[PDB]
Every structure is written in structure tokens, then in C-alpha cells.
């Protein structure tokens, strides 16, 4: 039988500040659910040490998404309320399975667009530059379809390891750190001003498939919101 997420501690924190959204934005789980064990080949802990999100389908998801924290709603913040929003993630992306040809693994989403989506990627070009099987962080700086509203960056390649990620937002910036070092510094976020309804994602959420049948999978040793205030 499959093994429960909340079978062990390292994921408590984070499982008591969001809702499980599988095989869609739909509800599939309450953070007072995800507490309770609850589990399905979608959402299991593999060697009794992963948090392990699985979705076949384009568009489909099978990812955490931030709450208020002790069975409270959905959270809205904003990027110029001046504290700091802070996601911290140790990530373990295994070779994807062919058809899987985009996963985001963490983002900032708001009502309406996704102003980060840090995604692994088979093949892309950026910037004259070709790259495959590596992390990149797609920032949305307006909500046209131009490559002008997006910033596309290549953050790492995909590790056969744990990558440690880390996304910080304040007064209007945004800091991506991977594996300790900065790789997006200070990137400007200032389009956003005055959305309050951003928040954090993380798990699996399949972009742009080559097959509705093939499963991306994608293992989280650690996952954090990081409360700069201590309530
Ligand atoms: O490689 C490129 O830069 C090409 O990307 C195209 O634009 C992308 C855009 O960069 C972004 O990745 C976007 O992401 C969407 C995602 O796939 C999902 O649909 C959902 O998360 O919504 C995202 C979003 O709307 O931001 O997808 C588009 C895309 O058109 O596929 C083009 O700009 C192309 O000219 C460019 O070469
Ligand atoms: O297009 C998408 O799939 C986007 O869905 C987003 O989640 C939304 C979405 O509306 C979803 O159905 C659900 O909405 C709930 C939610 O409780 C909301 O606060 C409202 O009060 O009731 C809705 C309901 O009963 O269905 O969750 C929403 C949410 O923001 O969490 C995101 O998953 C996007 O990432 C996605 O692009």
C-alpha cells in the first residue's frame, strides 16, 4: 500500500499551509485532509523520505498551493507589501518519461497569471543559447503573449541529486537561489504592484506534453512557506 506524506514529519509544516489541487485546479485535498494521510498514486511518499506529486495530461496538475496556515483559506499577498515572501524547496527531478517536455515545480500565481514558474524543461533555447534537461525560471513582467512580457532564465541543470531552491520576494524584487548560490538577482516584479492575490505553488504541473499518457514525477525531500514574521 502506498504511504502516506503525512506519515512522517519533514512535510508538516508546509501540508498544514496548503490544499492539494490533482488532476486540475480542482480541490482534490484541505490541508486538514492532507494532515489526515491522505494518499494516492498522485501524492505518496516514496523511500519514506519524498514527497512525490505524478500527473499525466496537458495543463494537468497534481500540486500544493498555499493557505492560510491552521485551516485557513486560500492566502493573497503582494509583491510591494513590503515583508519578505519566502519559499524554500529541496527538489529531486528523476529522468522524465517520454511525451514530458515542461514541469513546474514551484511558482508564484496569482487570481489570474503565473508571475514565476520555476520548470524543468527537456529542450529550449534561450537567448541564442541552446539547453536541455535543466531548471529554468520564467518570470511574467506583463500579461501579453510577447516574448517582451516574459524573462526566461536558465537556472541549473537538472541534477541526478537534491537541488535546493529558494524563492524570495520583497518591495518589488525577486531573488531565485539554487543550491546556495544567487542566479536571479533583484528581478523586477514592480508590474505586480498592488495584486494581492499571489501565492505560492509547488509539486507538479505539466506543460506542453507531446503525449497525454506520460507521467512527469517529481520528488520533494523539503518544502517550505517561511514566515519572516514569526506568527
Ligand atoms: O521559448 C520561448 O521563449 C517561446 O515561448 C512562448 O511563450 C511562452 C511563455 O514563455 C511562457 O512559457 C508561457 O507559459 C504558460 C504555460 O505554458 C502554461 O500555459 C501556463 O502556465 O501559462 C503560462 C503563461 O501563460 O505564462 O507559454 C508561452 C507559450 O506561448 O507557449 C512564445 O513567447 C514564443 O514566441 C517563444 O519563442
Ligand atoms: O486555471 C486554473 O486552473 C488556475 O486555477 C487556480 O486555482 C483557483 C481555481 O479557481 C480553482 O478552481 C479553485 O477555486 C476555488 C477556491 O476556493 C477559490 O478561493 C474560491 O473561493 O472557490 C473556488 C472553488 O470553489 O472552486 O482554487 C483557486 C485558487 O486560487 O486556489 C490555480 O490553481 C492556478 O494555478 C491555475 O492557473
Given at each position: 500500500?502506498?504511504?502516506?506524506?503525512?506519515?512522517?514529519?519533514?512535510?508538516?509544516?508546509?501540508?498544514?499551509?496548503?490544499?492539494?489541487?490533482?488532476?486540475?485546479?480542482?480541490?482534490?485535498?484541505?490541508?486538514?485532509?492532507?494532515?489526515?494521510?491522505?494518499?494516492?498514486?498522485?501524492?505518496?511518499?516514496?523511500?519514506?523520505?519524498?514527497?512525490?506529486?505524478?500527473?499525466?495530461?496537458?495543463?494537468?496538475?497534481?500540486?500544493?498551493?498555499?493557505?492560510?496556515?491552521?485551516?485557513?483559506?486560500?492566502?493573497?499577498?503582494?509583491?510591494?507589501?513590503?515583508?519578505?515572501?519566502?519559499?524554500?524547496?529541496?527538489?529531486?527531478?528523476?529522468?522524465?518519461?517520454?511525451?514530458?517536455?515542461?514541469?513546474?515545480?514551484?511558482?508564484?500565481?496569482?487570481?489570474?497569471?503565473?508571475?514565476?514558474?520555476?520548470?524543468?524543461?527537456?529542450?529550449?533555447?534561450?537567448?541564442?543559447?541552446?539547453?536541455?534537461?535543466?531548471?529554468?525560471?520564467?518570470?511574467?513582467?506583463?500579461?501579453?503573449?510577447?516574448?517582451?512580457?516574459?524573462?526566461?532564465?536558465?537556472?541549473?541543470?537538472?541534477?541526478?541529486?537534491?537541488?535546493?531552491?529558494?524563492?524570495?520576494?520583497?518591495?518589488?524584487?525577486?531573488?531565485?537561489?539554487?543550491?546556495?548560490?544567487?542566479?536571479?538577482?533583484?528581478?523586477?516584479?514592480?508590474?505586480?504592484?498592488?495584486?494581492?492575490?499571489?501565492?505560492?505553488?509547488?509539486?507538479?504541473?505539466?506543460?506542453?506534453?507531446?503525449?497525454?499518457?506520460?507521467?512527469?514525477?517529481?520528488?520533494?525531500?523539503?518544502?517550505?512557506?517561511?514566515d519572516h514574521h514569526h506568527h
Amino acid at each position: 500500500f502506498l504511504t502516506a506524506v503525512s506519515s512522517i514529519d519533514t512535510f508538516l509544516p508546509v501540508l498544514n499551509e496548503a490544499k492539494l489541487q490533482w488532476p486540475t485546479s480542482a480541490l482534490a485535498a484541505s490541508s486538514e485532509e492532507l494532515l489526515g494521510g491522505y494518499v494516492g498514486s498522485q501524492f505518496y511518499l516514496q523511500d519514506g523520505k519524498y514527497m512525490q506529486f505524478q500527473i499525466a495530461g496537458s495543463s494537468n496538475r497534481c500540486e500544493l498551493r498555499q493557505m492560510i496556515p491552521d485551516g485557513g483559506s486560500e492566502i493573497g499577498w503582494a509583491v510591494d507589501d513590503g515583508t519578505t515572501h519566502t519559499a524554500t524547496s529541496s527538489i529531486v527531478v528523476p529522468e522524465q518519461v517520454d511525451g514530458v517536455e515542461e514541469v513546474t515545480i514551484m511558482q508564484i500565481h496569482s487570481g489570474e497569471a503565473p508571475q514565476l514558474r520555476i520548470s524543468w524543461i527537456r529542450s529550449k533555447s534561450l537567448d541564442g543559447v541552446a539547453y536541455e534537461d535543466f531548471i529554468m525560471s520564467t518570470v511574467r513582467i506583463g500579461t501579453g503573449d510577447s516574448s517582451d512580457n516574459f524573462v526566461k532564465t536558465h537556472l541549473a541543470d537538472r541534477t541526478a541529486g537534491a537541488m535546493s531552491f529558494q524563492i524570495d520576494v520583497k518591495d518589488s524584487k525577486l531573488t531565485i537561489t539554487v543550491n546556495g548560490n544567487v542566479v536571479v538577482n533583484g528581478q523586477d516584479l514592480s508590474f505586480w504592484d498592488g495584486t494581492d492575490s499571489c501565492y505560492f505553488k509547488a509539486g507538479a504541473y505539466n506543460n506542453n506534453p507531446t503525449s497525454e499518457s506520460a507521467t512527469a514525477r517529481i520528488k520533494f525531500a523539503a518544502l517550505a512557506w517561511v514566515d519572516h514574521h514569526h506568527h
